[PDB]
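Q: Predict the assembly, please.
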Amino acid sequence: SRVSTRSSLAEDLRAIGLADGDAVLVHAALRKVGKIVGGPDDILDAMRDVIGPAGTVLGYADWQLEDEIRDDPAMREHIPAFDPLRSRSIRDNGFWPELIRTTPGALRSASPGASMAAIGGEAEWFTADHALDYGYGPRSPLGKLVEAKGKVLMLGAPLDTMTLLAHAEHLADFPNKRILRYEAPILVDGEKVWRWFEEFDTSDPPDGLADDYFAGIVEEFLATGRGKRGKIGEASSVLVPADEIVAFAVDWLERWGRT
Amino acid sequence: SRVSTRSSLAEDLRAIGLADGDAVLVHAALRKVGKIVGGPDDILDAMRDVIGPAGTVLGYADWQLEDEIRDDPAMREHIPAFDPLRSRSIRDNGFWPELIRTTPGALRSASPGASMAAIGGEAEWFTADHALDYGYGPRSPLGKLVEAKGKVLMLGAPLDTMTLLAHAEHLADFPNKRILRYEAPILVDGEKVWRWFEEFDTSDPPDGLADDYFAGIVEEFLATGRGKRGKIGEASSVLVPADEIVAFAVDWLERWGRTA
Ligand SMILES: CN[C@@H]1[C@@H](O)[C@@H](O[C@@H]2[C@@H](O)[C@H](O[C@H]3O[C@H](CN)CC[C@H]3N)[C@@H](NSCCNC(=O)CCNC(=O)[C@H](O)C(C)(C)COP(=O)(O)OP(=O)(O)OC[C@H]3O[C@@H](n4cnc5c(N)ncnc54)[C@H](O)[C@@H]3OP(=O)(O)O)C[C@H]2N)OC[C@]1(C)O
Ligand SMILES: CN[C@@H]1[C@@H](O)[C@@H](O[C@@H]2[C@@H](O)[C@H](O[C@H]3O[C@H](CN)CC[C@H]3N)[C@@H](NSCCNC(=O)CCNC(=O)[C@H](O)C(C)(C)COP(=O)(O)OP(=O)(O)OC[C@H]3O[C@@H](n4cnc5c(N)ncnc54)[C@H](O)[C@@H]3OP(=O)(O)O)C[C@H]2N)OC[C@]1(C)O
Ligand SMILES: [Cl-]
Ligand SMILES: [Cl-]
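A: Predicted assembly structure:
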C-alpha cells in the first residue's frame, strides 16, 4: 500500500502495452488502484501522457433511466430525456466513465443505453453517428474500436464487464438471439421525444450461458497468450487488442451455437 | 414512498420562498430528499425553473487537496495544481457542488479552498475576481451574495455547513482572530506555480466556541421569525436571506468577542 503518481501510473501503463497513438476503452474498479496523489484523474492524465494527443481514452457511460420507471405510465411526463451532454453515466459502471465524461474536451455518443464517453484526438469520430437501434453493432464506438485496432484495458475491473464482447454478441451468428423492444425518451435538438428502440439483449446472456460467461472468454483469450496482464498501481489489470478478442469471441459464440 | 418530480420540487421551492430572479447558495444532503424521478439534477432544473434565466444557483466546491499531502515535501512535484475547470469538488461537501460544477454552462471561481460553482444568469459575476487570500471576505461569491441580496438554502443539510457564516467570521471584529498561512499549487496562465496563501481559519472555530456553533447562530436567527422552513421532497430545509443572516452573525460574534 504505497502511493501512485501521474508519472508512476504512466510507467505502469507502458509496461502493460499502452503505446503512442492508442485508442483504449477502459473499464475500472478504481478502489483497486490504491492511493493516488491527485486522485483518479491522475490515471486519465497518465493515459493521455502515454498515448499522446492522437490517442483516445473511452469509457462506457450508459445512463440512469431505470426500466421500471421507463415503463410506468404515471412517470412518462416526468422522465428527463436522454441528453448526451447532460445525462450522467449509470452508477453501476463505476466513477470511471463519469470521470471521463465530466473532463472538459470529452464527448459522449448519442445511443442512450450503449453510449460511450471519449476524450482525445479521435474522440469526435468514436462518438459520432452512434446507431440508436443495435448500438452494439458496427455503427457504434465498439465497432470503431475494432476498426481502429484499439485496445481494452480492464483496470482492476472483473473481466465479465468487458462490454466489447457485447459487440461480439451482435456480430456472432448463433440461434435464438433475444431481441429487446422498448420505448425511451431522447432529446431531439433540445426537445424531448419518446422513440421506440430495438437491439439484441445485452442485460441477459444467451440462453444456456452464465451471466459471467464473458469472464471465461477473456480467460481463454489470455491463455492464447495474445493479452497482457499487468499491475496498474495496485490493481490487477488486463490489456487486450480489440479486433483480436472480438474475432476470438465471435468464433467462440458461433461454435457454441452449432452445438 | 413519496416520489419527487421536477414539477413537485419546483412547488416545494416556491413554497419555501425561492422566487423569480433569486441568487441562491445551496448546501445539500441529497439523500434526505428521498426518491427523485430524474435524480438530483431534477432539483437543479426545478430551481432554474423557479428563479428563471436571470437567477443563479451556487454550490460550495472547494477542492480535494489534503493538508497532509500538501505539506509533505515528498509529494510536492506530484500534486496537481488547482484548476477551476478541472479540479473536482471536495467530497466532504456532498455531490451537490459537483453536480452544479459538471453541468455545462456552470462556472467555478479561482480561490481554491473557498471556490464556488455557479450556474445561471449571474454565474460569471459571482465567480469572477475571487480573492486568493481571504477568499471568504468582500471579494468573493459570498460577499457578492450579500451584495446581490441572495439567499441560502440548506437542503436537508446540517445547519453548521452554512459556509456564508465564514464570511461573517471574516467581517466580525472580535479579538485574537486566528490567521492561517499555507502554500498550495495553482495555475498562472496555464502553468503550475506554488503560492503562499493567507486567510482567517475556517476549518476550526474561534477559541472557546464549539465546532458546530454555526448551527446555533442559524437557529437563533430563525428564532427571530426571519427565514423559512419547509420540506423539499422529504428533506427538512431552511431558506434564509444572505444579507440579514450575515448582519445577525456579525453582531452575534462581535457581542461574543466583548465578553470574557
Ligand atoms: C438503459 N440502461 C441499461 C441498458 O444500457 C442495458 O444495460 C446492460 C447491463 O444490464 C448489463 O449488465 C449485466 O452484465 C454486467 C457485467 N457482467 C453485470 C450486470 C449484468 N446485469 C451490461 N453488461 S456490461 C457492464 C459494464 N460495467 C463496467 O464497465 C464497470 C466495471 N467496473 C466494476 O465492475 C467495479 O467492480 C465496480 C462495480 C464499478 C465497483 O468498483 P469500485 O467501487 O471498487 O471502484 P469505482 O470505479 O466505483 O471508484 C471508486 C473510487 O473512485 C474515487 N472517486 C469516486 N468519485 C470521486 C470523486 N468525485 N472525486 C475524486 N475521486 C472519486 C474514489 O477513490 C472512490 O473510492 P472511495 O469512494 O473513496 O472509497 C451491458 C449493459 N448494456 O440494460 C439494462 C438497462 C438498465 O436498461
Ligand atoms: C483546501 N481544502 C479545505 C479548505 O477549504 C478548508 O475547508 C474548510 C473545512 O475544513 C471546514 O470544515 C469544518 O466545518 C464543517 C461544517 N461544520 C464540518 C467539518 C469542520 N472541520 C468548513 N466548514 S463548512 C462545510 C460545507 N459543507 C457542505 O456544504 C455539505 C452540506 N451537506 C452535508 O453536510 C451532508 O450531511 C453530507 C455530508 C453531504 C452527507 O449527505 P448525503 O449522505 O445525503 O450525501 P450527498 O449529499 O452527496 O447525496 C448522495 C446522493 O446523491 C445522488 N448521487 C450522487 N452521485 C450521483 C451521480 N453520479 N449520479 C446520480 N445521482 C447521484 C445519489 O442519490 C446519492 O445517494 P446514494 O449514494 O445513491 O444513496 C469550511 C471549509 N472552508 O480547510 C480544510 C481544507 C481541507 O484545507
Ligand atoms: Cl427532458
Ligand atoms: Cl441519510
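DSSP finds nine helices and nine strands in chain A. The beta strands of chain A are 23-28, 56-60, 107-108, 116-120, 151-155, 179-188, 191-200, 228-232, 235-241.
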